[PDB]
Design a protein around this ligand. Structure first.
Ligand SMILES: Nc1ncnc2c1ncn2[C@@H]1O[C@H](COP(=O)(O)OP(=O)(O)OP(=O)(O)O)[C@@H](O)[C@H]1O
Ligand SMILES: Nc1ncnc2c1ncn2[C@@H]1O[C@H](COP(=O)(O)OP(=O)(O)OP(=O)(O)O)[C@@H](O)[C@H]1O
Ligand SMILES: [Mg+2]
Ligand SMILES: [Mg+2]
Lengths: 58, 842, 236, 398, 415
């Protein structure tokens, strides 16, 4: 929804401060892995560079 | 903001431009010398920002007036140079042009590449802005071009050179200015641009490229452009100029592929070999080899093609013991087309008479024609079997045997001419069926011949009042397709007289549509001479006046891409007012045939046809599937097939019939298992209606044509070379299919055999210089250009390794992966000759 | 789960630590070796040392005895230990029995020593693979961190193994080793198929029949590289 | 049947050079588009029956139309229909409704006042699924992929060749591969290959994130996956691309993690759709993940995912191809020797080459140059390539 | 180093002008108006009219539809909770309108008091809530769609190498049904449940498909996504109604495909966990065994991760027999190769024993993939016959190419 709002208000700049929280090195499975944070990671990664190309979004 | 160097340079420029206030002697030479030096230094460098030009933002009005008053000599020329360089960045188009026009000549090379490009653009703008009212301005612009073109040639800027030379409408200098390393680039540029440029510049560009290729002695390419121009004199000139016998054999192969048969004088050595190659007698033999390479000698049977073992036998042993005539005709077309050109069939060769005896009248003609169409390109072999069926008890089927002859002699020619001899005594036959068979066989055997004797022999049929309407229509179509793309005044005048003397009541029939056909078939690809044709046809009254005008408009612009004609045709289609919708149908076919010249135009014609289908009236809905079939013959694009499958279930019987024929034509010879499954599903769904079953079985036969080794594409040489005979054949079939019930489902199934006139095979049989077959490893893939205008042969990717002979699907090309051999023709299509490489060392 | 000990068999009978020991060889610089009728040659990818580093201590071709030399690929310290043990064993064999140690015997000893470090837990296997060349008859053998030795007409181990061997099989012909210069040129070409610097990163050692070792100076190797380039210049 | 809804695409205009040929082709496109506009504008303008049919049917049903769930069919014209509030009503089925379309659980249009069955709603597609369908095909084509010949060939044999040429598969007897996982280091061309195949394919394309198929409410995850795959079934020739399957494809394991068990349930529904009870039909699945070793074995096993296409870091020839493709639109100088960038062992991927080209362009713009040089590329290499910290051991190995 | 200077407006104008501009402006404008034109066409057509249940005109042609609309009235469905029976003359009836409310109403004069029994569902008018018509008992729609009603084309001859598994399966799901007399004579109650477990792709779902193919009884393929409902307790009710429907059919078969979805391990240290899924699993446990005997409902359960199942579910009173599918032996793998290469256009000299031995630890799915890859290799180079070399290349591509990192130099450790 953040990226869809940025596209609807294009051009746009998204500032993601302190990306260590969501963005850190991906873990394996097991109970140690945060999993859901990695899911948000993957969704953001595709959003900013995936099948659909962002236009005028930095 | 600026920097220390930038500020100092700005101060120097301002001082130099401000010193020009007064008329001191040591001002104009020093200041203009300094400005010239700085401007030349900055412009004759990399594409860095021209710092003097950025700093310079003054007004030249005082400079222009002083130019007017000071120093009629070279100082005003220096000022002109400076203001031209300044105005190249600004918008001073006319002034910036005339500064170089009348100022210091020097040279355009002394300024820079960007200056040359901007001057070229301004010169093109002025030339387009200059009419024939005065030629005074044209000459100095020509002098500017005299130096602009070599600059581009030497700096790999052939793009701008070609563009400028097209704007000035003069292209002669390319003959004397093209180098050895750049001829391919400009030649490809022209051969690609010809399709999109409108008349008459396309023909001038084509002959310019022809002259360039003649100058560089690329004779096969010269032949390709000559057939593009469709003029025999330059073809003869190229034939005489061909001093290499291997290139002579190659051009004979291509002439036979295009079906152009030019008389060869005895002065040329190896005349007999060239003549026999051009007659294409060898092709069948090679085809046989082809088949025995793929282990597809064994012909098929309609029962296995329909795959009755898979269809749900809802009625078992009680509803399939009755053999209706129409399904028998469909099975004949299948056990023909599918097994055609393989030299053998398991049901029409050993059980001929028994098969034919369960056919009535029209079935007799259809099966007799299919008997010849089961063996292609074997005149003697075909006639050895056709003679007995010509000697049949039911002499009415004699005409069918002639079709067999006409369908066996198709794609080949003999010195003794068995077809002409066999039909000379049968053309004048009083029986309608006999004369019909005679004229159809003569036309099919002599497609693209343009021989005067046959035309003169066919002339009296038009004036024969006794001859029936369908005889007249078949005679007109045969005359047109014997004289494809020639604008023969004799045939044109004969058909015009015949239609003028024809009465309205006799014109109201469907077969009268075939009267403009031959007329139109006389004028394929030549829209210049059709102003007189439309003026002559304007005498007849509407609605058939508009019908004939539309049809000749289609035939004139076959593949031309003239968007104005397409706009007129779309206006005709969109006019919402039976016979009135015939104009819209012909115009829809016109959009199809004009747009099929270019891939881009064709793919947009797809969207236009979709819009027509989803928003048009019944007649347009019936007409569109024929157009879709015309657009993508033997090109099983999945989107087209999906649309046709969607509309095969339409509640309008005519729309479904046309969609089924579009399946048959578009997927013809591709052996598409998906298309075969969809056709089987359609046969299962339409199991009740005889007409839908007949046409779906016809489509299955078309898609299994030659076991997947035959195509009906009217295009050759990377789809760039049009085929007049094939275009004529599809045009006849489609216009006859505009009325499926009366013609196709009526008395005129034989018209379908006109597609065999377009029947052309696909192989990769490779011959040596002595014409023996030669297996060569070949890299086959899609011709998707991964570059722009680099001149590459589309940089074939999707590679696969094959051993010749090879089968190439539509849209996929081939290349020689071995440097051991060099092909005379770089376009690896059909039969080719590979010269052993003299450069290769073991 | 079966790769944290050397004495545990995997469910499919794999000694995974032994297999992991070969990756240390796979991380080493390429060492090639061939045998001729009268010579045994072996080139080494001599990777460039730092500007201030002395290259004398960096030795990959080591002579086990006057009749046999050895070039390793893998961990350098394990290589030093194995080379020292091989020298000691060859001297001991010459002490016990008068005749000098055969290259086959020294390779057998090295392979057994490497194997005996893969049979016991709490003892890391040697992470080196060796090429041992010598005369008794020119013989070339290759060891393995697992502890298996083999006789080869031509190998190459280390970083470039598949590529250099692929070059080697369709280059090692009877006429290729017909001349000593031809064999050395073949070694140089095989090493140049991987070491893409030329000359400066090539070290070839040649042992002739009943002769001594001779490390090729970077002028004879330069001359052979120039000759190879001249021979390959026949393409144009 | 509801055949495929293939994405629309304009014909490719080449050459890409700013020349007159490009102008002519683009103006031909403009011409045909204007023809379509003129026809579609004058069509309804000249429109002078079924209006009685509409004035009867629409008046009888009335507006607004409620959307309910069919539960039971009692009589030929009576049905128990549950409204969205969960309240069941015994309503009547009006005559203008196809009785063969009514099935239990179907979405049914009811009158607002008497809730009588006035029609049946056909699509009733979750908005989170209809957004997965691709309408505008991506511009990237197979000509924009340097190297990767083996990978492209495998993907074409899997998801492209069966559509165009099922003859080979039917003749030999193979069932064509119906599952492909594109795995490898990031920036190698997996998503690029998905874009290329979407551009080329004539079948409907569904793009998934592997994380948008996951919902808040307890049972909506697997239900959404089932809806997506059913929609793929509807448009028979279909390709379902699930980028970053790592999000749900992670290996199954036992823990409390009340959300993770729903995660595993969603992935279980996915693998049931791929290969479980009942056939899957003519729908291909393309999956991409950076880390494949962390995926559950039951998901990437054959039969569910038939092919595992590896995307390695580009080699010298592949890297040269990437540089040639990505500098095609550039204006290279004569002093540029791309080879120095292609050689060395920087372990640069296709995305790295793209960034190198972009940064070289920026470097040229810094010196006010519209043409790049060798020095700009050399500077860009070090400026952009600084990604990994050490990645290597010390001088242990000789 | 030298700092990067800013890009002034004059510099921007020069860079965007001092270059290709003969056709750049025209090309860019043409592209922009092309996009705008495409938007115009899409907007102006822009309908794609949604299909609605509009019957053909001849089907309805009914002007009496309005008469049905105004005359007939809607009825809310509600089950009669109780019969008050005040004096058997003014009996009163307590009904429950699903979730709306509960009411005390009387029947309309159309229906008879004896025709309205306690507990059944009836239609009530929306104004006075009076009973108007009895209704057939509720049948959940998704539960009836959970049935198969269409036997798949997977016979028992398409499952190779699992002879013991097939025989033990038929001993629980086929033999006690077709010939029950072979058991009661020996006084043996056959197992009423089977858990199919093993490595993925070993053939559990294939065996379930074969069972459904030749069941001859009611087969219910339970969807794991429907027992998982949004609302609390709806999955448990789903299980109850599913088991009731199974009991209505005579000797029904139920196949809980992929039971790990709703067959997890019960827990509370996770501070809530699933709960609802655990409650549904507990109700399934209750239905399988316990009070209220399950009846003649043989239960099929398959999962390729059985160690995560609840021990209560794994207890041999619910899943009595535990059939294990293991990696096929050499003979089984030869049988699988012959099964999957039966329809292929291959040579007659293919040594399938060789290929089976070349895939030591491989499931049947991997064998099928090997056969398909051999066909693909035979198609790539356009040969119409798949030879032995194609199968060997397929085996290398499928098994060896992804098995492990034990390279040939590392594979030299064995001889
Ligand atoms: N082989 C290649 N040829 C051409 N361009 C490439 C290639 N590989 C990568 N690129 C470029 O890199 C860009 C980004 O790569 P891409 O989107 O394919 O990433 P990916 O491999 O899917 O990575 P991830 O693991 O992040 O999903 C592409 O848009 C393309 O321009
Ligand atoms: N013995 C066998 N004979 C033939 N084919 C087999 C055999 N075993 C497995 N297969 C093949 O394996 C394919 C997939 O296996 P299956 O659907 O049974 O997986 P599963 O082990 O139940 O896995 P999951 O954990 O996803 O439930 C089947 O389509 C079938 O072709
Ligand atoms: Mg990606
Ligand atoms: Mg399964």
């Amino acid at each position: 929804e953040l990226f869809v709002m940025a596209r609807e208000h294009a051009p746009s700049i998204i500032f993601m401060d302190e990306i260590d929280s969501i963005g850190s090195s991906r873990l394996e499975g097991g109970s140690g892995g945060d999993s859901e944070v990695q899911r948000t990671m993957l969704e953001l990664l595709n959003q900013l560079d995936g099948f659909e190309a962002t236009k005028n979004i930095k | 903001e600026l920097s220390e160097e930038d500020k100092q340079l700005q101060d120097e420029l301002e001082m130099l431009v401000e010193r020009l206030g007064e008329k001191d002697t040591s001002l104009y030479r020093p200041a203009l010398e300094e400005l010239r030096r700085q401007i030349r230094s900055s412009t004759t460098s990399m594409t860095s920002v021209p710092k003097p030009l950025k700093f310079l933002r003054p007004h030249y009005g005082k400079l222009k007036e002083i130019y007017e008053n000071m120093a009629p000599g070279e100082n005003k020329r220096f000022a002109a140079d400076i203001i031209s360089v300044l105005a190249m960045t600004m918008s001073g188009e006319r002034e910036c042009l005339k500064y170089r026009l009348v100022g210091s000549q020097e040279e355009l090379a002394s300024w820079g590449h960007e200056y040359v490009r901007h001057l070229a653009g301004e010169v093109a703008k002025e030339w387009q802005e200059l009419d024939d009212a005065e030629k005074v301005q044209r000459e100095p612009l020509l002098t500017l071009v005299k130096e602009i073109v070599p600059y581009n040639m030497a700096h790999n800027a052939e793009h701008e050179a070609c563009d400028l030379l097209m704007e000035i409408e003069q292209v002669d200098m390319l003959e004397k200015d093209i180098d050895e390393n750049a001829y391919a680039k400009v030649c490809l540029y022209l051969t690609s641009c010809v399709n999109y440029v409108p008349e008459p510049e396309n023909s001038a560009l084509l002959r310019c490229a022809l002259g360039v290729f003649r100058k560089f002695s690329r004779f096969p390419e010269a032949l390709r452009l000559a057939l593009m121009l469709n003029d025999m004199e330059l073809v003869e000139d190229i034939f005489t100029s061909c001093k290499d016998v291997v290139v002579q054999k190659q051009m004979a192969f291509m002439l036979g592929r295009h079906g152009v048969f030019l008389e060869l004088s005895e002065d040329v050595e190896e005349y007999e070999d060239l003549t026999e190659i051009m007659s294409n007698v060898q092709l069948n033999s090679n085809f046989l080899a082809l088949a025995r390479e793929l282990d597809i000698m064994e012909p098929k049977v309609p029962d296995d093609i329909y795959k009755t073992h898979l269809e749900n036998n809802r009625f078992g042993g009680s509803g399939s013991q009755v053999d209706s005539a129409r399904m028998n005709l469909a099975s004949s077309f299948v056990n023909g087309f599918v097994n055609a050109a393989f030299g053998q069939d398991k049901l029409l060769t050993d059980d001929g008479n028994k098969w034919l005896y369960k056919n009535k009248d029209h079935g007799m003609l259809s099966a007799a024609a299919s008997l010849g169409m089961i063996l292609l390109w074997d005149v003697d072999g075909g006639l050895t079997q056709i003679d007995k069926y010509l000697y049949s008890s039911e002499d009415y089927i004699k005409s069918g045997a002639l079709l067999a002859c006409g369908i066996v002699n198709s794609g080949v020619r003999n010195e003794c001419d068995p077809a002409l001899a066999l039909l000379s005594d049968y053309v004048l036959h009083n029986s309608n069926t006999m004369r019909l068979g005679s004229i159809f066989g003569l036309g099919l055997a002599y497609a693209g011949s343009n021989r005067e004797d046959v035309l003169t022999l066919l002339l009296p049929v038009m004036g024969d009042s006794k001859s029936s309407m369908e005889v007249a229509g078949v005679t007109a179509l045969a005359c047109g397709m014997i004289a494809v793309g020639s604008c023969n005044g004799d045939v044109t005048s004969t058909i015009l007289q015949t239609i003028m003397e024809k009465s309205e009541t006799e014109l109201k029939d469907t077969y009268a549509r075939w009267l403009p056909l031959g007329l139109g078939l006389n004028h394929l690809g030549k829209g210049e001479a059709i102003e007189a044709i439309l003026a002559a046809l304007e005498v007849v009254s509407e609605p058939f006046r508009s019908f004939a005008n539309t049809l000749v408009d289609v035939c004139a612009y076959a593949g031309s891409g003239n968007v104005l004609k397409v706009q007129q045709l779309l206006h005709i289609c969109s006019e919402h007012f039976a016979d009135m919708g015939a104009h819209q149908g012909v115009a829809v076919l016109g959009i199809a045939l004009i747009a099929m010249g270019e891939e881009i135009g064709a793919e947009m014609a797809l969207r236009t046809f979709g819009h027509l289908l989803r928003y048009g009236e019944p007649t347009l809905r019936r007409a569109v599937p024929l157009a879709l079939a015309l657009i993508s013959v033997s090109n099983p694009r999945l989107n087209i097939l999906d649309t046709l499958s969607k509309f095969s279930h339409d509640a309008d019987p005519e729309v479904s019939y046309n969609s089924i024929f579009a399946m048959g034509m578009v997927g013809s010879g591709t052996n598409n298992a998906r298309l075969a499954a969809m056709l089987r599903q359609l046969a299962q769904y339409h199991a009740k209606d005889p007409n839908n079953l007949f046409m779906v079985r016809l489509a299955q036969g078309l898609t299994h044509l030659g076991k997947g080794t035959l195509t009906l594409c009217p295009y050759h040489s990377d789809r760039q070379l049009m085929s007049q005979v094939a275009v004529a054949g599809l045009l006849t079939v489609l216009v006859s299919f505009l009325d499926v019930r009366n013609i196709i489902l009526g008395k005129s199934h034989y018209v379908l055999y006109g597609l065999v006139a377009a029947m052309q095979p696909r192989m990769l049989v490779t011959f040596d210089e002595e014409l023996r077959p030669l297996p060569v490893s070949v890299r086959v893939g899609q011709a998707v250009d991964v570059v722009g205008q680099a001149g590459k042969p589309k940089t074939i990717t999707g590679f696969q390794t094959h051993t010749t002979p090879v089968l190439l699907a539509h849209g996929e090309r081939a290349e020689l992966a071995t440097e051991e051999f060099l092909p005379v023709t770089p376009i690896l299509e059909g039969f080719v000759i590979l010269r052993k490489n003299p450069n290769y060392d073991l | 789960s079966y790769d944290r000990a050397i004495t545990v068999f995997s469910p499919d009978g794999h000694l995974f630590q032994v297999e992991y020991a070969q990756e240390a060889v796979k991380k080493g610089s390429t060492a090639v070796g061939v045998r001729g009728r009268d010579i045994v040659v072996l080139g080494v990818e001599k990777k460039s040392v730092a500007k201030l580093q002395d290259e004398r201590t960096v030795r990959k071709i080591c002579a086990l005895d006057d009749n046999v030399c050895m070039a390793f690929a893998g961990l350098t310290a394990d290589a030093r230990i194995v080379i020292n043990r091989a020298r000691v064993e060859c001297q001991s064999h010459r002490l016990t029995v008068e005749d000098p140690v055969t290259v086959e015997y020294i390779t057998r000893y090295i392979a057994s020593l490497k194997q005996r470090y893969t049979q016991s837990n709490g003892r890391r296997p040697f992470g080196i693979s060796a090429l041992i060349v010598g005369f008794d008859t020119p013989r070339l053998y290759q060891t393995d961190p697992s502890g298996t030795y083999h006789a080869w007409k031509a190998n190459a181990i280390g970083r470039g193994a598949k590529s250099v061997r692929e070059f080697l099989e369709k280059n090692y012909t009877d006429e290729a080793i017909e001349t000593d210069d031809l064999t050395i040129k073949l070694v140089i070409k095989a090493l140049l198929e991987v070491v893409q610097s030329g000359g400066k990163n090539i070290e070839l050692a040649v042992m002739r029949r009943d002769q001594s070792l001779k490390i090729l100076n970077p002028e004879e190797i330069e001359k052979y590289v120039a000759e190879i380039e001249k021979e390959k210049e026949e393409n144009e | 049947t509801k055949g495929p809804d293939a994405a629309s695409k304009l014909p490719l205009v080449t050459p890409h050079t700013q020349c007159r040929l490009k102008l002519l082709k683009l103006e031909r496109i403009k011409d045909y588009l204007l023809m379509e506009e003129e026809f579609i504008r004058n069509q309804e303008q000249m429109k002078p029956k079924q209006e009685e049919e509409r004035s009867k049917v629409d008046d009888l049903r009335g507006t607004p139309m409620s959307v309910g769930t069919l539960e039971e069919i009692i009589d030929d014209n009576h049905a128990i229909v549950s409204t969205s509030v969960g309240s069941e009503h015994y309503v009547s089925i009006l005559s203008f409704v196809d009785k063969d379309l009514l099935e239990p659980g179907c979405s049914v249009l009811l009158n607002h006042k008497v809730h009588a069955v006035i029609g049946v709603l056909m699509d009733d597609t979750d908005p989170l699924v209809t957004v997965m369908k691709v309408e505008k095909a991506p511009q990237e084509t197979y000509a924009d992929i340097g190297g990767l010949d083996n990978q492209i060939q495998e993907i074409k044999e899997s998801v492209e060749l069966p559509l165009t040429h099922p003859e080979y598969y039917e003749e030999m007897g193979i069932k064509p591969p119906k599952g492909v996982i594109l795995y490898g280091p990031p920036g190698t061309g997996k998503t690029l290959l998905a874009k290329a195949v979407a551009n080329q394919t004539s079948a409907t394309f569904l793009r998934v994130v592997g994380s948008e198929l996951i919902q808040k409410y307890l049972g909506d995850g697997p239900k959404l996956v089932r809806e997506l795959f059913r929609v793929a079934e509807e448009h028979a020739p279909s390709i379902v691309f699930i980028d970053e399957i790592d999000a749900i494809g992670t290996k199954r394991y036992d823990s409390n993690s009340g959300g993770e068990r729903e995660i595993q349930r969603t992935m279980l529904e996915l693998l049931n759709q791929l290969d479980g009870f009942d056939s899957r039909g003519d729908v291909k699945v393309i999956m991409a993940t950076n880390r494949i070793e962390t995926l559950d074995p039951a998901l990437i096993r054959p039969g569910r995912i038939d092919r595992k296409i590896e995307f390695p870091l580009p080699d010298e020839k592949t890297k040269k191809r990437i540089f040639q493709i990505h500098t095609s639109r550039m204006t290279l100088a004569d002093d540029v020797t791309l080879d120095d960038l292609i050689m060395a062992k920087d372990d640069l991927s296709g995305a790295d080459i793209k960034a190198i080209c972009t940064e070289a362009g920026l470097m040229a713009l810094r010196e006010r140059r519209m043409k790049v040089t060798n020095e700009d590329f050399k500077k860009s290499k070090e400026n952009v390539l600084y990604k990994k910290q050490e990645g290597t051991p010390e001088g242990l190995y000789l | 180093d030298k700092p990067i200077r800013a890009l002034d407006e004059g510099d921007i104008a020069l860079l965007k002008t001092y270059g290709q501009s003969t056709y750049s402006r025209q090309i860019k404008q043409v592209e922009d108006d092309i996009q705008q034109l495409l938007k115009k066409i899409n907007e102006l057509t822009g309908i794609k009219e949604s299909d609605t249940g509009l019957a053909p005109p001849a089907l309805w042609d009914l002007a009496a539809d309005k008469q049905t609309l105004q005359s007939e009235q809607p009825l809310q469905v509600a089950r009669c909770t109780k019969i008050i029976n005040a004096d058997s003359e003014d009996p009163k009836y307590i009904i429950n309108v699903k979730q709306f409310a509960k009411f005390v109403v009387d029947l309309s004069d159309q229906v008879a008091p004896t025709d309205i029994e306690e507990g059944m569902r009836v239609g009530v008018d929306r104004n006075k809530y009076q009973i108007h018509i009895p209704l057939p008992p509720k049948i959940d729609p998704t539960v009836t769609m959970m049935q198969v009603e269409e036997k798949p084309d997977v016979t028992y001859s398409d499952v190779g190498g699992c002879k013991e598994q097939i025989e033990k399966l038929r001993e629980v799901v086929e033999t006690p049904l077709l010939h029950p007399e072979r058991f009661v004579n020996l006084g043996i109650e056959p197992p009423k449940g089977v858990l199919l477990f093993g490595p993925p792709g070993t053939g559990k779902t294939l065996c379930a498909r074969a069972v459904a193919n030749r069941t001859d009884a009611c087969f219910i393929r339970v969807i794991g996504s429907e027992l998982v409902q949004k609302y609390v307790g709806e999955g448990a009710r789903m299980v109850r109604e599913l088991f009731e429907m199974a009991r209505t059919k005579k000797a029904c078969l139920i196949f809980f495909d992929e039971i790990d979805a709703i067959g997890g391990a019960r827990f509370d240290d996770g501070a809530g966990g699933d709960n609802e899924v655990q409650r549904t699993m507990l109700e399934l446990i209750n239905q399988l065994d316990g009070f209220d005997p399950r009846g003649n409902i043989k239960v099929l359960m398959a999962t390729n991760r059985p160690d995560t199942l609840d021990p209560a579910l794994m207890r041999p009173g619910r899943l009595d027999r535990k059939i294990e599918f293991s990696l096929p032996d050499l003979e089984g793998r030869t049988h699988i190769f012959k099964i999957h290469a039966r329809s292929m256009s291959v040579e007659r000299d293919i040594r399938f024993e060789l290929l089976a031995r070349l895939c030591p630890n491989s499931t049947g799915a991997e064998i099928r993939s090997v056969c398909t890859e051999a066909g693909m290799f035979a198609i790539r180079a356009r040969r119409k016959i798949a030879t032995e070399k194609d199968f060997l290349e397929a085996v290398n591509k499928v098994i060896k190419s992804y098995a492990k990192f034990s390279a040939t130099p590392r594979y030299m450790t064995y001889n």
